[PDB]
């Protein structure tokens, strides 16, 4: 790679941190600020014929400015490659945000859902559906006071909604019913995914576990709060998740209605005295990504592109 002068003059590019089928990720420290970013290099020879899938992702990243999102800092376009300076979030993913968190309570989970719901609200205001909201795409941004804020990344499936979508995209665990049914879906699939995540935040395992049995569970949308894991969980929290996981799209909460819900709106409702023994269930059901502040932390989100995306949901044909 012959990095353009414009980049190397203001950024000191270092080692290759990550790699992909269509993208390479390198170290990238801004010289003036000494702030650490990620230099995403896309070989244009690989994206030919499918320019739109890359270009549509970038044009979205170009527009979205929100603290709870992995932002595109700068882009340098040359005939042979596309350069993208991306935010390098090193605090680990959502599962690490639970594990690393001692004295983990309902206030912590509610705080994370606020960051998530806020980001979704911002996207939906621009008529952008993410379609890939999952713990692996929620990186942790650690502040100087020790507090944490989530940042939604991987816009490889993101798209503008002009009407009902029908492409069966997404991870089976977090996919909404209307996607599975192929009856037409829109923005509120992000709410469903966020609802699945919220359920995991409070007990450490998905609401729908069941492959075909899983799809049937999602389609029916019957949320169970089994004992004793949900006994000491607030009813307001269980009420919220119920409204986020409604099969009826119109009844299902919007991003606003989630943020306006007491358990999210009022920062006094969430329990902060009694902890949530969730760490045990996370390891049992989910994988563990790169260690926080490791070399490969938050790199996977940047290493991937829209061309790396594939269908995963396959019902037994009716």
């Amino acid at each position: 790679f012959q990095i353009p002068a414009t980049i190397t003059e203001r950024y000191k590019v270092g080692r290759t941190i990550g790699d992909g089928n269509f993208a390479v990720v390198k170290e990238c420290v801004e010289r003036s600020t000494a702030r650490e970013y990620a230099l995403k290099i896309i070989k244009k020879s690989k994206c030919r014929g499918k320019e739109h899938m890359i270009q549509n992702e970038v044009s979205i990243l170009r527009r979205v400015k929100h603290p709870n999102i992995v932002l595109l800092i700068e882009e340098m376009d040359v005939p042979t490659e596309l350069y993208l300076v991306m935010e390098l979030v090193k605090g680990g993913d959502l599962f690490d945000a639970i594990t690393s968190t001692n004295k983990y309570t309902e206030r912590d989970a509610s705080g994370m859902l606020y960051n998530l719901a806020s980001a979704i609200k911002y996207l939906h205001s621009l008529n952008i559906v993410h379609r890939d909201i999952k713990p692996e795409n929620l990186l942790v941004y650690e502040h100087q006071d020790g507090s944490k804020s989530l940042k939604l990344g991987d816009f490889g499936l993101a798209t503008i909604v002009d009407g009902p979508l029908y492409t069966v995209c997404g991870t089976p665990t977090y996919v909404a019913p209307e996607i599975i049914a192929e009856t037409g879906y829109g923005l509120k699939v992000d709410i469903w995914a966020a609802g699945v995540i919220t359920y995991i935040l409070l007990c450490g395992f998905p609401p729908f576990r069941g492959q075909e049995v899983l799809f049937d569970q999602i389609l029916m949308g019957q949320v169970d709060f089994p004992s004793p894991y949900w006994d000491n969980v607030s009813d307001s929290a269980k009420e919220l998740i119920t409204m986020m996981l409604l099969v009826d799209v119109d009844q299902r909460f919007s991003a606003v209605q989630v943020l306006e819900h007491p358990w999210v709106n009022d920062d006094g409702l969430p329990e902060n005295e009694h902890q949530l023994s969730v760490a045990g269930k996370i390891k049992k059901h989910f994988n563990t990504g790169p260690k926080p502040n490791s070399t490969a932390a938050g790199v996977s989100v940047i290493a991937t592109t829209a061309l790396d995306k594939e269908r995963q949901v396959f019902r037994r044909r009716r």
Side-chain angles (χ1 to χ4, degrees), residues 51-213:
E51 294 83 344
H52 58 281
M53 278 193 285
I54 297 295
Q55 289 172 350
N56 286 343
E57 181 179 2
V58 173
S59 60
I60 284 173
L61 292 176
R62 220 147 59 199
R63 174 61 183 84
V64 292
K65 253 68 200 167
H66 197 276
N68 302 118
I69 294 175
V70 182
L71 299 177
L72 171 65
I73 308 302
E74 181 180 4
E75 71 199 49
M76 174 63 179
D77 192 272
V78 292
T80 42
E81 302 88 3
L82 172 63
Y83 295 84
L84 298 172
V85 182
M86 300 291 291
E87 282 187 322
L88 184 61
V89 195
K90 281 289 183 180
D93 59 51
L94 185 70
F95 295 138
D96 301 327
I98 305 167
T99 305
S100 307
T101 302
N102 305 338
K103 58 176 184 301
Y104 180 74
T105 62
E106 260 181 39
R107 191 187 276 186
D108 293 308
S110 180
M112 294 178 191
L113 177 55
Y114 183 90
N115 298 329
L116 174 56
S118 294
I120 295 171
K121 179 189 173 186
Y122 175 77
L123 294 174
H124 290 187
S125 72
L126 309 173
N127 302 284
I128 298 167
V129 60
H130 189 272
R131 296 197 307 180
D132 201 26
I133 296 175
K134 58 178 186 287
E136 290 74 0
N137 292 342
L138 291 166
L139 308 179
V140 188
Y141 189 94
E142 304 177 36
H143 297 297
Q144 55 181 311
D145 62 334
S147 63
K148 295 172 176 176
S149 293
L150 295 181
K151 297 170 77 72
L152 183 65
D154 197 347
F155 279 64
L157 290 182
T159 180
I160 307 296
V161 286
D162 189 29
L165 300 171
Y166 296 94
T167 55
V168 190
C169 319
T171 302
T173 302
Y174 308 94
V175 158
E178 56 269 20
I179 302 174
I180 295 172
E182 303 183 35
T183 53
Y185 66 92
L187 297 171
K188 278 187 176 178
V189 299
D190 292 334
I191 305 299
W192 181 278
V196 174
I197 290 170
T198 304
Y199 186 97
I200 298 164
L201 285 174
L202 293 176
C203 70
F205 54 84
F208 320 115
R209 313 174 284 286
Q211 189 84 339
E212 185 66 16
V213 184

Side-chain angles (χ1 to χ4, degrees), residues 37-55:
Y37 304 103
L39 182 62
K40 182 177 182 176
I41 311 175
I42 301 173
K43 218 82 183 67
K44 284 185 175 181
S45 64
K46 310 305 179 210
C47 88
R48 88 175 55 257
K50 298 174 170 184
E51 294 83 344
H52 58 281
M53 278 193 285
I54 297 295
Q55 289 172 350

